[PDB]
């Protein structure tokens, strides 16, 4: 059953990857007196004891495997070896292991499936680069015992899922059941690699007990590469010769890189910054603490200079909110613009609608109208069509009437001078302000009703200079009238 | 001609860098069954054949060069060697090469200039670190044949443009024209490096054919450095022991770092995030799909929490848009503020302008005026001077008149209580609202015309408490009146 | 005194780290003809002279130390050695050193404290990996002379503050005062490491002069690691095989990562970008030059596409500014929304307030009112409670009166059709518009005063369809009325 073999293989590879990870750290983080401390890996201390100082010397894959139990490392049932590669406080009272690793390289408890699986790790060989005590390790060999090729495929699959690979795979054999009995299987004196196995399966003495030796190069993929072919678990930056700066790491989604504070931060406010190095502050997008509308803990981003003053972003902004009507639909809007403008009819012939009862509005063409180009809306997500919007609010309005010379003196075309001509005022009936649009233009027009008490005459004015408005323009998922 | 030699040198260095890149990848990406797969480089497989398993053993730069064609690799015209270092599908039907590399290390076709240039690669030596089959390679030597010092300068120039350097450069010679004939040129038994060449050019036997051996250390600059002195082509992050997270790489401008999704993303929405790790969501700036105003494909950035709700940025915002007037000029604006305020004249002596025909406005000093500090505008690009802006729109307005006690009861100073005092109302003539500014203050003032029908009296009021406005403030490249 | 010993140890470690940094750069940056140039470190040139080519060959920590002054490097007072590891232009006229390093590995002047401290560097051994001239260096040994264990603790403390560690520490001795006299102290022929020192202090011949040999592995922590355990000083990206792209480095706070332009940038506008790779522009947040409100040099961030057009961010925005009142307090606001709406009373029975003098407003329940859900405010920093805000500005208003059929024809419910029904207009007295709120609702109501000249009748209208408003909604630290 492939499924069964895959589960065994996944557990085997997890063990293998963890042991290799440990070998690949010459400096390790442990807990002493309740705090993290860097120490030399006991593997690489001249004064360490068994099993940390154990080395084999078969640098050539084809050379004789060690037969000496002080050189190879016995593994699995009946051995105590696991305690030296797992945390001291795997149990509350502490094991005989001397190191509280800050992380687990391998689980405290051996994976359950491996307690009686057909394939188990029987022995580990730390191949030394030289003959010194605590020597560097240039290869890690795992001898897997078969409890009597399908497995190689599932092992390779598990390996590729774990960012490791096998330097090679050899067939090994022993005459009995001892860890010291293992030796390379040979064909005419030539050690048998798995690649040569299909061809030579016929001459394989069935009296032997067989196994596989899996070789891992602990330095392969250990370092980040100029060509980018090795992934980073994280990357942290230095300050003053210490790894005290911010860190970047991926979350589980595959989309996000996450910035967190460095150990050197007196405050917890991670920031991504830009610097021109041309004499002014760098600008940072920084995460700071805040509170939500229910006074619950939250955070936000702040764009700031080094004095902590807000800085500027040039961008189109969309804001999303629940519709304030009975709708629970969400709506989008942009930042508005505001324009001050008066209508522009000035003389009686343009201003006065002489038969207002019969008059029909031609807003696209009326004299004195306010006309504007329809804005282009910015990009929106999905899903959500934005409409150009325009509103007009009254800014000044007077019931002007003809003066002695039959002229209208009130004029609101310039906000700074609206009071400058008082006008001859009648009684206001009010104003109707209409906004219309084509595909490309906004049309804003207005009528005003005025009673002239001097002549007892009722007037309707079209687009008068003595009516001005503040025009608001924006884009929204909420449509225009 | 330098220009000619530089072009040859650029092509030579490109070939060299590509071969070295290949050597420096023990694990490579190939295409099999239409998909990318990681395999061991055939250079480092015990079962590979010629030319992948070819090694020389001259680790010392001064030791004898190989004379054995199964050790060195013959290169160039008359050899088939290029097919093993180029893609199988360099031609549609496939070459005899067995590997479809996912990328080209060197071009399918040898650079045209090198077909008959004065300087060509004649032979390549993969110097083995040990005597095993598929041994690691600690040096790559390129023997360049001269078809009869200027070139060394252009070679070094080309090398520096390609992030590689020469471990050393030796003069080599042969008596005839065979690739196996090359040997180190010597001066009194001492192999001649290019640095020693100027001094010893005189004793150089003119009967020989000469060449240069260029040595490259494939591990030099291979890995990213703690001190930052090696550039990254890209950097990708891991998830669960796989290189499945997001990637960062530069675009061609030299200004931009670009974030793209990882192979593990179920969606394509790359994000840069901040995390306080204090119990609430991380915040992400994420790129999502959208549509532009013409319904064409586009994208945008979304600041969101892990529930996908928009999050908050504290910042000054500038928005750019085409002027909605006939101008095609672009304009900038900021986010406005809104303020509710009533004018504040309450009693008759302050309110009534007794000789309105003669009265001249003193807006900087008039009682009841609305006065505000002029805002500071944020930073703007270039190029684009921002002006403080202010507008006022009518929020409530009534034609109040004196009551029995000669008082004005209408009062709009508090929006929540505007209807609370009805007032004794006359007929409205309207209002003129003016906005003025000094360098530091905004002045908002107003006159209102009212006819009192009870006493048949016409009034002009100054800055009345029964006129209120919504004041909008913002900054813009569009100037104030 | 610990404090004294710590200061000596800090200076010793600084010297050590700098020398090791130099050893760890095979390619170095120097200044020649006024510009930065990469060259091979003189340590690794076959043609270099003393002291660069000096090597010892004791690869085994326990093997005999060199006695040859052309192998070890004499250090300190009486030697000239420092000039070869410091900049040529440590003095203006230039030293006899041949290299202007672009950075100082160690200070021009030896740290003052080390001129007569009890512990000094007496000698340095560059342990060669092989027997070639300019060989790579696999270990750097520093022999520290005691001028007659406390120091080991302070040395280790200084080392951990500098991202370096000791491979080991040995006790050494000499019979006299010569740099060539040093040898490993032994106990029964076994070289004495510091770890064994406590046990064996008793048999230590007091006639000798003692010292400590500190061994550093120059490759330990040299490269960035897949597991993220080595910090980066900086990281720069490549373009076209050159380290020409942008760089990231931490500032001194521990919170910030800073992006700066690459050497390949023709402009100085560093950007962080997102790319979907789905056929449209990548989006970049780019830093550009600008000017502040006083026309002083500044910068800002611009969100743009590859054509340089502003792009879109979906987010909640907070803007901070000084209160424009006498307050110097800062205030926060959000981006407003705008809504056009008319009140909705249409027939006389709803519209006319028949006894307006006695009528009390019931705004939560009045017919024709405008009612909206109160918005939720976004997250705010600290510190700063946001309030929902709402204002209303007049958009159209007419003094409508009953027609022949006793109906009111004026209707502003649709902005695009406000002029469509003219109405029968009286004289406007004005309008009082009130805004109130519960915890969950906004209530907007209005009264209008109108005089009907046809019937000489004075009217007060409630929430009339011939009054419309533009409603602005936003959140602010400035409270609502």
Enter the tokens of residue B316.
């000054």
Distance, CA of C139 to CA of B166 (rounded, Å) = 24
B396 at interface of C, judged by CB pairs closer than 8 A: yes
Distance, CA of B44 to CA of B25 (rounded, Å) = 10
Contact (CB<8Å) B232/A220: no
> Dihedrals φ, ψ of A409, to 5°?
-90, -30
Do residues B48 and B26 share a domain? yes
The answer to whether the CB of B336 falls within 8 A of the CB of B326 is no
Distance, CA of B390 to CA of A340 (rounded, Å) = 9
Angle formed at CA A305 by CA B271 and CA B339, multiple of 5 degrees: 95
The number of beta carbons lying within 10 Å of the beta carbon of residue C222 is 17
Helices (H), C24-127: none
CA–centroid distance for C113 within its chain: 36
Do residues A175 and A62 share a domain? yes
A386 at interface of C, judged by CB pairs closer than 8 A: no
Among C113, C95, C210, CA closest to C158: C113
Enter the tokens of residue A428.
């206001």
Within 13 Å, how many C-alpha atoms sit on residue C110's CB side? 19
Contact (CB<8Å) A300/C379: yes
A243 at interface of B, judged by CB pairs closer than 8 A: no
Break chain C down into helix, strand, coil percent, rounded to 5. Answer: 15, 35, 50
Contact (CB<8Å) A239/C259: no
DSSP states along C320-389: EEE-SSS---EEEE---EEEEEE--B-SHHHHB-SSTTT----TTT-TT-EEEEPPPP--EETT---EEE
Residue C289, strand partner residues: C299
Residue B189, strand partner residues: none
Residue A363, strand partner residues: none
Enter the tokens of residue B416.
């929540």
Residue C317, strand partner residues: B313
Enter the tokens of residue A393.
């609010």
Residue C304, strand partner residues: C284, C310
* Residues in chain A closer than 8 A to B444 (CB atoms): none
Among B251, B253, B294, B290, CA closest to B269: B290
Do residues A352 and A338 share a domain? yes
Distance, CA of C417 to CA of C39 (rounded, Å) = 79
Within 13 Å, how many C-alpha atoms sit on residue C230's CB side? 26
Distance, CA of A354 to CA of A349 (rounded, Å) = 9
Residue C232 host element (H or E): none
Enter the tokens of residue A183.
């030796």
Enter the tokens of residue C296.
């002083």
Do residues B80 and B195 share a domain? yes
Distance, CA of C318 to CA of A317 (rounded, Å) = 12
Q: In this structure, are strands C27-32 and C35-40 parallel, antiparallel, or unpaired?
A: antiparallel
A380 at interface of B, judged by CB pairs closer than 8 A: yes
Closest chain B C-alpha to C378 CA, distance in angstroms: 7
Distance, CA of C413 to CA of C408 (rounded, Å) = 13
The answer to whether the CB of B289 falls within 8 A of the CB of C277 is no
Distance, CA of A138 to CA of C275 (rounded, Å) = 41
The residue from C200, C231, C262 where one domain ends is C231
Enter the tokens of residue A435.
């906004």
Residue C190 host element (H or E): strand C190-191
Contact (CB<8Å) C256/A271: yes
Distance, CA of C259 to CA of A271 (rounded, Å) = 11
Interruption sites in chain B after residues (C→N beyond 2.5 Å): 148
The answer to whether the CB of C428 falls within 8 A of the CB of C413 is no
> For chain B, how far is it from start to end, CA to CA, in angstroms?
68
Sheet strands (E) in C41-107: 73-74
- The SS3 call for residue C421 is coil
Query: Is the bond leading into C13 cis (omega within 30 degrees of zero)?
Result: no
* Beta-carbon contacts of residue C43 (< 8 Å; ≥ 6 apart): C22, C23, C26, C52, C53, C126, C134, C137
Long-range own/partner contacts, residues A178-184 (CB < 8 A, 24 or more apart) = A179/A69, A179/A72, A179/A74, A179/A75, A179/A122, A179/A123, A179/A143, A180/A67, A180/A68, A180/A69, A180/A72, A181/A67, A182/A65, A182/A122, A182/A123, A182/A143, A182/A211, A182/A213, A183/A64, A183/A65, A184/A62, A184/A64, A184/A65, A184/A213
Among C19, C230, C14, C11, CA closest to C137: C19
* Beta-carbon contacts of residue B196 (< 8 Å; ≥ 6 apart): B187, C47
Enter the tokens of residue A305.
């200079």
Do residues B192 and B326 share a domain? no
Distances (CA, A) of B212 to A61, B143, C390: 36, 6, 82
* Beta-carbon contacts of residue A216 (< 8 Å; ≥ 6 apart): A16, A20, A139, A140, A141, A142, A164, A165, A166, A167
Angle of the C2-23 helix axis to the C150-160 helix axis, nearest 10: 50
Dihedral, B81, B84, B86, B87 alpha carbons, nearest 10 = 140
Contact (CB<8Å) B338/C474: yes
The number of beta carbons lying within 10 Å of the beta carbon of residue A196 is 17
Residue B58, strand partner residues: none
* Beta-carbon contacts of residue B416 (< 8 Å; ≥ 6 apart): C434, C435, C436, C437, C480, C481
The number of beta carbons lying within 10 Å of the beta carbon of residue A444 is 22
The residue from C216, C231, C246 where one domain ends is C231
Distance, CA of C478 to CA of B372 (rounded, Å) = 15
Angle of the B150-160 helix axis to the B2-23 helix axis, nearest 10: 50
Domain span at C125:
1-231
Angle formed at CA C3 by CA C1 and CA C8, multiple of 5 degrees: 100
Contact (CB<8Å) A276/C255: no
* Residues in chain A closer than 8 A to C159 (CB atoms): none
Distance, CA of C28 to CA of C38 (rounded, Å) = 6
Closest chain C C-alpha to A457 CA, distance in angstroms: 12
Long-range own/partner contacts, residues B348-354 (CB < 8 A, 24 or more apart) = B348/B402, B348/B406, B348/B407, B348/B408, B350/B462, B350/B463, B351/B408, B351/B461, B351/B462, B351/B463, B351/B464, B352/B459, B352/B460, B352/B461, B352/B462, B353/B447, B353/B460, B353/B461, B353/B462
Technique of determination: X-ray
Cβ-nearest to B276 among A299, A372, A381: A299
The single-letter DSSP state of residue A90 is G
Interruption sites in chain A after residues (C→N beyond 2.5 Å): 148
Do residues C254 and C155 share a domain? no
Residue A142 host element (H or E): strand A137-146
Do residues C7 and C62 share a domain? yes
Distances (CA, A) of B265 to A164, A382, B248: 21, 19, 15
* Beta-carbon contacts of residue C433 (< 8 Å; ≥ 6 apart): B395, B396, B418, C392, C394, C444, C445, C446, C469
Distance, CA of A401 to CA of A209 (rounded, Å) = 116
The answer to whether the CB of C231 falls within 8 A of the CB of A231 is no
Among A220, A159, A142, CA closest to A11: A159
Q: In this structure, are strands B312-314 and A297-304 parallel, antiparallel, or unpaired?
A: parallel
Angle formed at CA C193 by CA C190 and CA C196, multiple of 5 degrees: 85
Enter the tokens of residue A430.
């009010």
Distance, CA of A131 to CA of A71 (rounded, Å) = 12
Cβ-nearest to A470 among B261, B290, B393: B393
Do residues A101 and A197 share a domain? yes
Distance, CA of C379 to CA of C385 (rounded, Å) = 9
* Structural domain count of chain C: 3
Do residues A71 and A131 share a domain? yes
* Beta-carbon contacts of residue B242 (< 8 Å; ≥ 6 apart): A161, A162, A163, A231, B263, B264
The residue from A280, A295, A316 where one domain ends is A316
Long-range own/partner contacts, residues C47-54 (CB < 8 A, 24 or more apart) = C47/B193, C47/B195, C47/B196, C48/C134, C51/C81, C51/C84, C52/C84, C52/C134, C53/C133, C53/C134, C54/C126
Query: In chain A, whose CA is at the least distance from the CA of C473?
Result: A324
> For chain A, how far is it from start to end, CA to CA, in angstroms?
68
* Residues in chain A closer than 8 A to C251 (CB atoms): 239, 273, 282
Could you say which residues from 109 to 138 on chain C have a Cβ atom under 8 Å away from some Cβ of chain B? 130, 132
C91 at interface of A, judged by CB pairs closer than 8 A: no
Distance, CA of B434 to CA of B363 (rounded, Å) = 9
Instruction: Please report where in the chains the tokens 């307006």 appear, as a residue.
Output: C356
Within 13 Å, how many C-alpha atoms sit on residue A456's CB side? 2
The answer to whether the CB of B118 falls within 8 A of the CB of B147 is yes
Query: What is the torsional sign of CA B312, B316, B321, B326?
Result: positive
Instruction: Please report where in the chains the tokens 């690489």 appear, as a residue.
Output: A44
Do residues C309 and C331 share a domain? no
Distance, CA of C24 to CA of C139 (rounded, Å) = 10
Distance, CA of C220 to CA of C141 (rounded, Å) = 14
Distance, CA of A50 to CA of A73 (rounded, Å) = 9
Distances (CA, A) of A256 to A259, B35, B255: 10, 25, 22
Distances (CA, A) of B465 to A396, A417, B396, B424, C469: 16, 22, 10, 14, 21
Among A330, A331, A323, A443, CA closest to A390: A443
Among B201, B451, A252, A41, CA closest to C427: B451
Residue A394 host element (H or E): strand A387-398
SS3 per residue for chain B: CHHHHHHHHHHHHHHHHHHHHHHCCCEEEEEECCEEEEEECHHHCCCCCCCCCCCECCCCCCCCCCCCCCCCEECCCCCCHHHHHCCHHHCCCCCCCCCCECCCCCCCCCCHHHHCCCEEEEEEEEEECCCCCCCCEEEEEEEEEECCCHHHHHHHHHHHCCCCCCCEEEEEEECCCCHHHCEECEECCEECEHHHHHHHHHHCCCCCEEEEEEEECCCCCCECECCCCCCECCEEECECCECCCCEEEECCCCCEEEEECCCCCCCCCCEEEECCCCCCCCEEEEEEEEECCCCCEEEEEEEECCCCCECEEECEEEEEEECCCCCCCEEEECCCEEEEEECCECCHHHHECCCCCCCCCCCCCCCCCEEEECCCCCCEECCCCCEEEEEEEEEEEECECCCCCCCCCCCCCCHHHCCCCCCCECEEEEEEEEEEECCCEEEEEEEEEEEECCCCEEEEEECECCEEEEEEEEEECCCCC
Distance, CA of C434 to CA of C432 (rounded, Å) = 6
Among C176, C169, C174, CA closest to C141: C169
Distance, CA of C392 to CA of A393 (rounded, Å) = 9
Residue B319, strand partner residues: B333
Q: In this structure, are strands A337-342 and A467-476 parallel, antiparallel, or unpaired?
A: antiparallel
Angle of the A2-23 helix axis to the A150-160 helix axis, nearest 10: 50
Do residues B276 and B335 share a domain? no
Residue C366, strand partner residues: none
Do residues B287 and B355 share a domain? no
C457-467: burial string, b at 16+ Cβ within 10 Å, e else: eebbbbbbbbb
Query: Is the bond leading into B346 cis (omega within 30 degrees of zero)?
Result: no
The single-letter DSSP state of residue C24 is T
Distance, CA of B469 to CA of A394 (rounded, Å) = 10
Closest chain A C-alpha to C93 CA, distance in angstroms: 31
Among A227, A239, A234, CA closest to A257: A234
Cβ-nearest to A292 among C17, C238, C379: C379
């Amino acid at each position: 059953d492939e499924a069964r073999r895959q589960i065994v293989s996944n557990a085997l590879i997890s063990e293998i990857a963890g042991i290799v990870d440990f070998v690949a750290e010459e400096q390790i983080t442990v807990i002493e007196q309740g705090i993290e401390k860097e120490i030399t890996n006991p593997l690489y201390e001249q004064s360490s004891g068994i099993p940390y100082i154990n080395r084999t010397t078969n640098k050539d894959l084809n050379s004789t495997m060690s037969t000496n139990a002080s050189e190879f490392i016995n593994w699995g049932a009946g051995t105590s070896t696991r305690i030296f590669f797992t945390r001291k406080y795997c149990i509350s009272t502490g094991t005989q292991g001397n190191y509280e690793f800050s992380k687990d390289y391998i689980p405290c408890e051996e994976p359950a499936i491996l307690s009686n699986s057909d394939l188990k790790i029987d022995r580990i060989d730390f191949v030394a680069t030289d003959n010194t005590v605590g020597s560097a390790i240039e290869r890690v060999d795992f001898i897997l015992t078969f409890d009597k090729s399908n497995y190689v495929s599932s092992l390779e699959k598990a390996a590729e899922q774990h960012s490791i690979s096998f330097k090679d795979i050899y067939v090994v054999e022993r005459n009995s059941s001892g860890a010291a009995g293992w030796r390379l299987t040979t064909i005419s004196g030539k050690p048998l690699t798995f690649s040569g196995l299909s061809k030579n399966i016929g001459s394989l003495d069935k009296t032997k007990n067989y196994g596989l030796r899996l070789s891992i190069d602990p330095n392969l993929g250990k370092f980040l590469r100029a060509d980018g072919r090795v992934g980073a678990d994280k990357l942290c930056w230095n300050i003053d010769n210490k790894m005290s700066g911010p860190c970047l790491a991926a979350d589980d989604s595959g989309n996000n890189l996450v910035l967190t504070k460095g150990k050197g931060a007196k405050s917890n406010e991670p920031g991504l910054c830009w610097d021109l190095n041309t004499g002014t502050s760098k600008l940072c997008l920084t995460q700071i603490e805040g509170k939500d509308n229910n006074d619950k803990d939250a955070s936000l981003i702040k764009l700031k200079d080094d004095n902590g003053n807000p800085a500027t972003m040039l961008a189109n902004i969309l804001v999303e909110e629940k519709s304030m009507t009975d709708s629970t639909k969400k709506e989008l809007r942009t930042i508005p613009n505001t324009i001050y403008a008066a209508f522009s009819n000035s003389n009686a012939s343009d201003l006065v609608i002489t038969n207002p009862g019969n008059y029909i509005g031609n807003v696209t063409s009326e004299k004195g109208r306010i006309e504007l180009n329809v804005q282009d809306c910015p990009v929106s997500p999905d899903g959500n069509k934005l409409h150009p919007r325009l509103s007009a609010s009254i800014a000044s309005i007077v019931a002007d009437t003809k003066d002695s010379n039959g002229k209208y003196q009130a004029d609101f075309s310039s906000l700074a001078g609206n009071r400058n001509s008082g006008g001859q005022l009648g009684y206001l009936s009010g104003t109707a302000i209409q906004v219309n649009q084509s595909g490309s233009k906004w049309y804003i027009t207005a009528t005003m009703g005025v009673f002239d008490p001097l002549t007892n005459t009722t007037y309707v004015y079209l687009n008068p200079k003595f009516l001005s408005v503040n025009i608001t323009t924006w884009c929204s998922t909420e449509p225009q009238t």
